[model samples]
Target: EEQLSKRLEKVASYITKNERIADIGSDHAYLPCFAVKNQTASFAIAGEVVDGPFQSAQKQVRSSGLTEQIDVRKGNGLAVIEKKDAIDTIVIAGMGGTLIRTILEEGAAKLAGVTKLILQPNIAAWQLREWSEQNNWLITSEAILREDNKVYEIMVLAPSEKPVTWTKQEIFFGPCLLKEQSAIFKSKWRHEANTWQNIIQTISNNQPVSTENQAKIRELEHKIALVEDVLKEG
Candidate 1:
């Protein structure tokens, strides 16, 4: 039986072979278990900060009979990874982009020796891309998957000596996603464009709107126009 959600199963398949991975915010230890059991990775660390989730992960690990291969740790982010952990890849999923950024920021020192990162953000994906660019983590591949009517973006990054750079459109919409423009990507942006149009209408309907609101309307108009162009091209 498959242990991961279909979306996450696709993500697990992208893991580099023979890596030692740390799965942060791992709720049930499913991804790590899948990694070790499939031999995609030699070992994995399932790190959960909360007690309930940590215990749940522990239960899953033991049930899989992988206590010797997977380490279930109870701590926050990189704190759970020790100097001797020898992890090359880290996976942070099922979290908001801001929280993921915070974890990486707080754990910056520990990433010096790390090689790759696979992140799946539930929302505010643009912020995650911007943060990655600023931190010199070059995005190498991107994918979008819809399950249960929810859209998820999976991003893969690797450390680079070259400085990060992206165009305004690329930063806002995701460079690789824009290039691909899959059906999922088109639907996501079309919905976003409609949302901006609604906001523009609300601002125009207000008889006595503040200057701040007027400025916001202009910004939304510009963004709406840009998104429309992209959708038309698609």
Candidate 2:
């Protein structure tokens, strides 16, 4: 099995064994190599947009003798997954939620056969959650962990015919993560709260503020309050 970094390993943990999968923005095809070597998926397509990484992925897959298992393709976002691929699972990691959402929306047709989506967004995970709800892709599981001094949120989503309504708080705090409030989660939010508080204090000392600054100050205050409220809970 290919040894993956802590972050890549976390993403791999959610994969379904023997599944046909695709990895979008798969720089160097690291995850694809890991999936194929570990036998997590029967086949994988490592989709990359840029030439450098695409070539790198090809070299890595070739050198690993996984050319038969993993295919490295150069294309933007979801367009890399062709209709004949019959990919059942998709994993998009090491990107922002905004770009992830864009890829899903732009390549909507390519997702017809994909049953499971394992997404790891480096930041702004809430935006992805919002898109999932609008598209009726119910979140099945999520993991929030800190590594290399950064917080990462991994979301596992599956499509649903029934309309699922996620509460405001559930959408904000991540429904599953809210239950346990892991130490790292608390640490992340506590730091955010303190950051907001510091901003509020610095803005308070500023001379007569513009309307925009005032609105921002109010927003930061509200966010700080929300973090505090959640941190104080069981």
Candidate 3:
């Protein structure tokens, strides 16, 4: 099988074997190719919005000689996927959390038949988790990986009929991650806690007294406290 970046390889490995997968914003088509080459999925769709990237994906797909297994399409987000395509899993990666949320929001109906989602947001993963909860997509697994000296969070979700509820702490800090408190998790949150503490110190020295600033300060303080508790527990 062809090799991929450590991060993308990990992301691709999460897909179940023989699944029909649609990879949104598949810039280089590496993920879909990996899925097909590894036999993780029987078929894969590489969806891209921009002309240049879409063309690049097409070239890559062709060069891989897996053209028969993977279909490259030009359309935005889930629009490239058809309702009758029999897609059971969706993987959206290398995008901001907000963009991922927008894609999911705009493509709500298309997800009705999806059994799994593997999302790897470059930032603001908490927002994605919150959105998933509101939409009744329960997070089944989460992985934090450090590659190229940067950290990333990969979340896997499955459709659920039951209501979704998560505590504030669980939303901010993933419940599974918090429970694990692996070294990587601690390192990631410890840096975040320190960053937030620095901001709190700066604002405290400025001594803003307005209700909004006060509330913001309190919020930061609460987050700091949460991180502290997690650290102590670990």
Candidate 4:
């Protein structure tokens, strides 16, 4: 039995036991296979838009002897989901926040029964945080980890009965991760600040500063300042 990746394992950690789950963009259905194999999910759907991956997911599930518990489907985004599936938890991992937001937006109706959302975005987690805020989903947990030298963030969201708002800073760094202020989180922000500082220095030294460059510099400075502000306490 193959093991899940670090990020996927983190994503899986958010799923409550016996959840009826769907893994959107599930490549080779590895996560779904892992979920059912470990009894984390009572039933699972592995949704893949691409044909090759869909077939691979099917093959993987069959070979794992989990065909009875896991279903590999082919469709775009949440289109593979159905009301009848009654999926209570949806896991979308290893994609950009923009695309993940789009998937949630386009598939809003399919989320009627969903109680939890576990997402791992490769970049721009703030965009998804904003979306979740607007859609009445509360961020219950956030985790940051560095694997293979790449930092990843996992955010778990649950339906909120009432409206909720997260501060600009909270959305940017994640409220839970901000509170924890883990070493990996600090390192990620510091690395970003250094990268932005280098960019600003390079741009300023290479050519005459235009209004546009001035604007870019100001934005970068503001971003770097935000990162620096958080790092000050630690």
- Name the candidate that leads on lDDT: 4
Stretches off by above 4 angstroms in model 2 are: none
lDDT (Cα, tens digit) per residue for candidate 2, span 11-50: 8888866889999988578888877777888899999898
Leading candidate by TM-score: 4
lDDT of 4 by residue, 1-234 (tens): 788888888888887678999999996888888888888899999999987888989999999999899988889999999999999999999899999999999999999989999999999999999997899899999999989989999999999999979887888999899999999999889988899999999999978889999999999998888887777742
Each prediction's Cα lDDT score? 0.87, 0.86, 0.88, 0.91
Better of 1 and 3 by TM-score: 1
Prediction RMSDs, each to the true structure: 1.5, 1.5, 1.7, 1.3
Residue runs of model 3 more than 4 Å from their true location after superposition: 207-212
TM-score of each: 0.95, 0.95, 0.94, 0.96
Native-structure RMSD, model 2: 1.5
> Between which residue pairs do clashes occur in model 2?
none
Best-to-worst lDDT order: 4, 3, 1, 2
Model 2 clash number: 0
Model 3 per-residue lDDT at 137: 83
True-structure lDDT of candidate 2 = 0.86
Question: Whose TM-score is higher: candidate 2's or candidate 3's?
Answer: 2
Q: Write the per-residue lDDT of candidate 3 for residues 1-234, one digit (tens) a residue.
A: 457988888788788769999999995999898888878898999999988999999999999898999999998889988888889999999999999999999998888689999999998888888997898888888888899899988888888899989887778877677788888999999998889889887877886567887788899989899888878842
User: Worst lDDT window (10 residues) for model 4?
Assistant: 225-234
lDDT of 4 at 76: 94
